[PDB]
């Protein structure tokens, strides 16, 4: 019945007994005197001159009595006003070469300071508006921005930070969602979100606790003001060695709420940012008070940005569909479409897609079946992600009908207005260090490193942010190759082939600039040398897993001759048994074919003939061949010209169950008619060159520059609303939208790239996680 001496205790009591923890308010189970004892407001949160060395009054919110320092319960400015200290902000950067902690502290603590709706460009306002944050940023380790996860909403991004996982893995696929096995819905407001069943993965505080590291309470009831959360953390830090937590979290609802009201560029934003900064300076002055301002790792992190969005920029689905009362839409900065009543019978997804596709000239959203969303969003492998999805343009809303704020967010995570912040400050972080942008999915690993914890399996690439840290507890180890390649010679005669096909050296060292890709699964496959390209031919999938080649700045683009239009040549080094045949392509009226190494970039007429081998051949829809041919004939040259040559590794992907991971044979669901030639769901390419663009690709001393994509292999170009125009109007726009990381392709292909470089392996991991966005 009473909280005396138990205020903000670090545990759950029960089973009937009343609570006094930071969550009891959300659970309607605080003792009767929680409010009176544990949430004192009397006399504000700041000592004043005439309060110094005072009568200790126990009704005060924080104290200025001489004993206060003993008890960890002074106000954060006590020593500034009374004992003549300066604010932490008014001190110089001083490098923290080691953690200066008091005796007993077995590790540097971590405090995560999470700000909601914090746009990366808010940092331009600087010390004029935010002195404390501008100090953390400048003195510590900072990125120009940090990419959130899609959808760029709060709960998916906050729980991605906590777990290292994509929203499709951790289960919090939106702020609002429906689960068809639970037959229940999750919303920001409601009791359903308290069920543990909605939250998967392993958040940081569980990884801490399971490995005997004490986790400071990680959620805050909204009735608890910010100055109090900050005093409670400081008080938890003053506890004995055997009771003290080593990891803490603070969360601010700003500047998101203000961001919605007035937009991200409104002059009103200044007061919310000043407020957050003063909160930060209470934390830093409190830490300095406890002599932990050079002991503690502080992470200043945001969940997403904020965009200009007004209600006059809305699209209504009732201008496109007729029976809008037969569906439920999740509206706003994304769309998710489902039947209203599951007992509909004639509810057809196919019809809905058709009706929403390329209707208006100014159309500000695009429909997708979820498996056809760009793979970089990794937003499909969850039963809570509705099959029909709407990618909404920046600055726009989507609603169901017209009878259903100047700022919003939720759009595609590459959009510049959705980018958010990262600062790391403290001993373990580096000093006055800029680092390149990175994805919030990586941080879980860093936070485990900072706490000496073994991360749970996650979507970060462990080691990929070692360059943020003064001291790494983790050195990445390159994985072991599983299947060694065959190098089969000439083993069959040309008359031994009837596949129904008609027609009429320093190869390793100039076509695999960065070593041979390692195959990390059990399979049989052949390496095949040619003058112009090298490939890893799969005998199970009857096509290359990868195909690698290099083009100089000065190299020639030629056409395909007319007499070799339908030329496909049988490959003597591979048995007919493990070869594709040209008959199935005849029998298959929808499927045609393309080539991985382009015949358009043959070094000579003689060399060109290797491009028409059966072992360079891949199943391709005529629709897709328009995309692929324009890439090969024009863009591969274009990129070679601009980047002083380029290396290119192209290949197929199979992902029919849309889990972002390499399909096994069992999981392949489409073959070329009357055959066992499997149809790729996507085609990838990894295009590398020298970052120092003065040096050419095959002679690069310095760092490496990469771009990649994963083009979806579709029988139409309905995704591209300008597809009926000439390829130069739409293909490169299609490709850029499906830009990808090297890492995404490795998940999808079970291969490992960049094994033979002169660069450190942690630097390669950064290169593999890098995403070209075109902003
Ligand atoms: C991103 O990283 C993650 C993590 O590395 C990758 O996802 C992981 O993918 C694995 C391979 O597909 C899955 O393995 C399968 O697990 C089945 C059992 O599932 C339950 O246990 C899981 C294990 O959990 C451990 O790890 C977490 C780490 O956070 C800890 O918290 C735990 O303590 C455990 O140590 C658990 O993850 C599963 O959780 C899923 O389901 C529950 C609901 O039941 C949800 O609450 C979760 O959000 C989560 O849902 C996701 O994952 C499932 C698939 O499991 C999808 O269906 C959902 O759509 C959603 O995405 C479960 O509680 C195994 O039985 C299964 O075995 C198969 O394969 C073996 C051989 O290997 C065969 O023998 C079997 O016959 C069988 O077919 C398989 O091992 C992991 O579950 C999954 N983990 C997570 C956290 O998502 C992901 O691919 C990465 N993404 C990319 C792009 O690389
Ligand atoms: C969603 C519920 C609270 C909603 C309001 N909160 C406002 C303050 N807030 C916050 O403090 O954020 C800190 C933070 C920072 C980062 Cl970087 C990352 C994260 Cl994830 C958070 C942000 C929001 C909360 C209240 C109670 C929560 C449940 C727990 O009582 C019990 C469980 C504990 C498990 O570890 C996870 C699952 C579960 C059910 C908790 C889920 C979230 C609940 C319901
Ligand atoms: Ca798969
Ligand atoms: Na055909
Ligand atoms: Zn948010
Ligand atoms: Zn918001």
Tab-separated table of C-alpha atoms in Angstrom, residues 524-710:
chain	number	residue	atom	x	y	z
A	524	UNK	CA	28.154	-28.329	-56.910
A	525	UNK	CA	29.224	-25.613	-59.385
A	526	UNK	CA	31.829	-25.004	-62.132
A	527	UNK	CA	34.213	-22.074	-62.663
A	528	UNK	CA	34.333	-21.080	-66.345
A	529	UNK	CA	37.055	-18.850	-67.825
A	530	UNK	CA	36.443	-16.716	-70.916
A	531	UNK	CA	38.431	-13.840	-72.439
A	532	UNK	CA	35.758	-11.237	-71.539
A	533	UNK	CA	34.190	-12.679	-68.345
A	534	UNK	CA	34.382	-15.400	-65.652
A	535	UNK	CA	31.409	-17.244	-64.101
A	536	UNK	CA	30.405	-19.711	-61.373
A	537	UNK	CA	28.020	-22.056	-63.187
A	538	UNK	CA	25.501	-23.965	-61.039
A	539	UNK	CA	24.833	-27.562	-62.099
A	540	UNK	CA	21.727	-27.638	-59.893
A	541	UNK	CA	20.185	-24.345	-61.107
A	542	UNK	CA	21.575	-24.753	-64.701
A	543	UNK	CA	22.891	-21.168	-64.818
A	544	UNK	CA	25.558	-18.940	-63.233
A	545	UNK	CA	25.284	-18.042	-59.565
A	546	UNK	CA	27.519	-15.112	-60.538
A	547	UNK	CA	29.198	-13.697	-63.671
A	548	UNK	CA	32.113	-11.262	-63.292
A	549	UNK	CA	33.625	-8.860	-65.836
A	550	UNK	CA	35.431	-5.519	-66.112
A	551	UNK	CA	35.086	-2.645	-68.597
A	552	UNK	CA	37.571	0.204	-69.027
A	553	UNK	CA	36.710	3.872	-69.502
A	554	UNK	CA	37.893	3.549	-73.125
A	555	UNK	CA	36.109	0.236	-73.991
A	556	UNK	CA	33.860	-0.173	-77.041
A	557	UNK	CA	30.106	-0.838	-77.180
A	558	UNK	CA	29.126	-2.847	-80.285
A	559	UNK	CA	25.761	-4.195	-81.462
A	560	UNK	CA	24.563	-7.813	-81.644
A	561	UNK	CA	24.860	-8.964	-85.300
A	562	UNK	CA	21.587	-9.954	-87.014
A	563	UNK	CA	22.827	-13.455	-87.965
A	564	UNK	CA	23.482	-14.175	-84.255
A	565	UNK	CA	20.107	-12.784	-82.988
A	566	UNK	CA	18.846	-16.273	-81.986
A	567	UNK	CA	22.345	-17.762	-81.503
A	568	UNK	CA	22.771	-20.024	-78.493
A	569	UNK	CA	25.838	-22.275	-78.410
A	570	UNK	CA	26.198	-25.491	-76.386
A	571	UNK	CA	29.028	-25.331	-73.788
A	572	UNK	CA	31.558	-28.203	-74.260
A	573	UNK	CA	32.833	-28.080	-70.617
A	574	UNK	CA	29.399	-28.869	-69.117
A	575	UNK	CA	27.419	-32.044	-69.759
A	576	UNK	CA	24.099	-31.818	-71.655
A	577	UNK	CA	22.569	-33.305	-68.485
A	578	UNK	CA	23.539	-30.158	-66.534
A	579	UNK	CA	22.791	-27.668	-69.348
A	580	UNK	CA	19.779	-25.559	-70.280
A	581	UNK	CA	18.152	-26.334	-73.603
A	582	UNK	CA	16.631	-23.929	-76.141
A	583	UNK	CA	13.475	-26.032	-76.636
A	584	UNK	CA	11.766	-25.093	-73.358
A	585	UNK	CA	12.047	-21.401	-74.395
A	586	UNK	CA	10.122	-22.262	-77.607
A	587	UNK	CA	7.489	-24.302	-75.648
A	588	UNK	CA	7.245	-21.463	-73.078
A	589	UNK	CA	5.227	-18.704	-74.775
A	590	UNK	CA	5.857	-16.102	-71.991
A	591	UNK	CA	9.521	-16.808	-71.267
A	592	UNK	CA	12.380	-15.699	-73.498
A	593	UNK	CA	16.049	-15.385	-72.487
A	594	UNK	CA	18.919	-12.995	-71.811
A	595	UNK	CA	22.641	-13.235	-71.143
A	596	UNK	CA	24.543	-12.300	-67.960
A	597	UNK	CA	27.782	-11.181	-69.601
A	598	UNK	CA	26.572	-8.782	-72.325
A	599	UNK	CA	27.302	-9.698	-75.950
A	600	UNK	CA	27.089	-5.883	-76.474
A	601	UNK	CA	30.472	-5.398	-74.701
A	602	UNK	CA	32.466	-8.132	-76.420
A	603	UNK	CA	36.118	-7.088	-76.871
A	604	UNK	CA	36.030	-8.494	-80.457
A	605	UNK	CA	33.751	-10.330	-82.966
A	606	UNK	CA	35.537	-13.617	-82.085
A	607	UNK	CA	35.268	-13.084	-78.313
A	608	UNK	CA	31.555	-12.135	-78.732
A	609	UNK	CA	30.743	-15.781	-79.513
A	610	UNK	CA	31.433	-16.825	-75.886
A	611	UNK	CA	28.617	-14.465	-74.820
A	612	UNK	CA	26.163	-16.723	-76.719
A	613	UNK	CA	27.136	-19.860	-74.715
A	614	UNK	CA	24.312	-21.810	-73.045
A	615	UNK	CA	26.143	-21.381	-69.710
A	616	UNK	CA	25.775	-17.544	-69.858
A	617	UNK	CA	21.979	-17.864	-70.543
A	618	UNK	CA	19.169	-16.855	-68.178
A	619	UNK	CA	15.327	-16.959	-68.408
A	620	UNK	CA	13.914	-13.467	-69.029
A	621	UNK	CA	10.486	-12.046	-69.814
A	622	UNK	CA	10.297	-9.828	-72.919
A	623	UNK	CA	9.110	-7.071	-70.554
A	624	UNK	CA	12.252	-7.597	-68.442
A	625	UNK	CA	14.545	-7.788	-71.513
A	626	UNK	CA	13.739	-4.108	-72.253
A	627	UNK	CA	15.125	-3.253	-68.794
A	628	UNK	CA	18.095	-5.620	-69.008
A	629	UNK	CA	19.192	-4.733	-72.583
A	630	UNK	CA	19.192	-0.998	-71.842
A	631	UNK	CA	21.350	-1.650	-68.742
A	632	UNK	CA	23.881	-3.748	-70.713
A	633	UNK	CA	24.059	-1.804	-73.996
A	634	UNK	CA	24.017	1.772	-72.601
A	635	UNK	CA	24.341	2.040	-68.788
A	636	UNK	CA	27.231	-0.384	-68.157
A	637	UNK	CA	29.236	1.702	-70.625
A	638	UNK	CA	27.885	4.938	-69.138
A	639	UNK	CA	29.050	3.908	-65.632
A	640	UNK	CA	32.434	2.758	-67.003
A	641	UNK	CA	32.963	6.145	-68.719
A	642	UNK	CA	32.057	8.195	-65.629
A	643	UNK	CA	33.882	6.075	-62.981
A	644	UNK	CA	37.101	5.362	-64.975
A	645	UNK	CA	35.954	1.817	-65.685
A	646	UNK	CA	33.887	-0.536	-63.527
A	647	UNK	CA	33.849	-4.173	-62.375
A	648	UNK	CA	30.422	-5.835	-62.664
A	649	UNK	CA	29.222	-9.029	-60.960
A	650	UNK	CA	25.765	-9.974	-62.264
A	651	UNK	CA	23.571	-12.982	-61.453
A	652	UNK	CA	20.086	-14.340	-60.616
A	653	UNK	CA	18.217	-14.425	-57.306
A	654	UNK	CA	15.494	-16.872	-56.254
A	655	UNK	CA	13.268	-15.636	-53.358
A	656	UNK	CA	9.756	-17.053	-53.904
A	657	UNK	CA	8.933	-17.088	-50.170
A	658	UNK	CA	10.115	-13.439	-49.954
A	659	UNK	CA	12.258	-13.762	-46.803
A	660	UNK	CA	15.257	-11.901	-48.322
A	661	UNK	CA	17.233	-15.162	-48.129
A	662	UNK	CA	18.453	-17.612	-50.818
A	663	UNK	CA	15.763	-20.140	-51.837
A	664	UNK	CA	16.585	-23.826	-51.745
A	665	UNK	CA	15.398	-26.014	-54.661
A	666	UNK	CA	12.351	-27.143	-52.673
A	667	UNK	CA	11.248	-23.464	-52.430
A	668	UNK	CA	11.352	-22.737	-56.245
A	669	UNK	CA	7.787	-22.447	-57.661
A	670	UNK	CA	8.227	-21.517	-61.326
A	671	UNK	CA	10.161	-23.302	-64.017
A	672	UNK	CA	10.377	-22.747	-67.752
A	673	UNK	CA	7.476	-24.877	-69.093
A	674	UNK	CA	8.197	-28.628	-69.362
A	675	UNK	CA	11.698	-28.296	-67.873
A	676	UNK	CA	13.695	-27.948	-64.667
A	677	UNK	CA	15.158	-24.524	-65.522
A	678	UNK	CA	14.208	-22.394	-62.507
A	679	UNK	CA	12.959	-18.833	-62.985
A	680	UNK	CA	14.724	-16.091	-60.928
A	681	UNK	CA	12.554	-13.682	-58.945
A	682	UNK	CA	15.233	-10.974	-59.344
A	683	UNK	CA	18.480	-10.201	-61.144
A	684	UNK	CA	21.334	-8.472	-59.263
A	685	UNK	CA	24.472	-6.628	-60.228
A	686	UNK	CA	27.371	-5.392	-58.102
A	687	UNK	CA	29.224	-2.592	-59.854
A	688	UNK	CA	32.580	-1.661	-58.226
A	689	UNK	CA	35.303	0.878	-59.123
A	690	UNK	CA	38.040	3.045	-57.553
A	691	UNK	CA	36.750	5.753	-55.145
A	692	UNK	CA	39.797	7.726	-56.200
A	693	UNK	CA	38.276	8.065	-59.686
A	694	UNK	CA	41.586	9.218	-61.238
A	695	UNK	CA	42.913	5.638	-60.897
A	696	UNK	CA	41.137	2.977	-63.014
A	697	UNK	CA	39.215	0.024	-61.541
A	698	UNK	CA	41.794	-2.732	-62.113
A	699	UNK	CA	44.601	-0.518	-60.669
A	700	UNK	CA	43.041	0.948	-57.501
A	701	UNK	CA	45.444	1.777	-54.649
A	702	UNK	CA	42.903	3.503	-52.421
A	703	UNK	CA	39.384	2.711	-51.177
A	704	UNK	CA	36.583	1.138	-53.225
A	705	UNK	CA	33.292	2.646	-54.456
A	706	UNK	CA	30.253	0.381	-55.024
A	707	UNK	CA	26.722	0.647	-56.350
A	708	UNK	CA	24.261	-2.263	-56.671
A	709	UNK	CA	20.683	-3.213	-57.489
A	710	UNK	CA	18.224	-6.116	-57.319
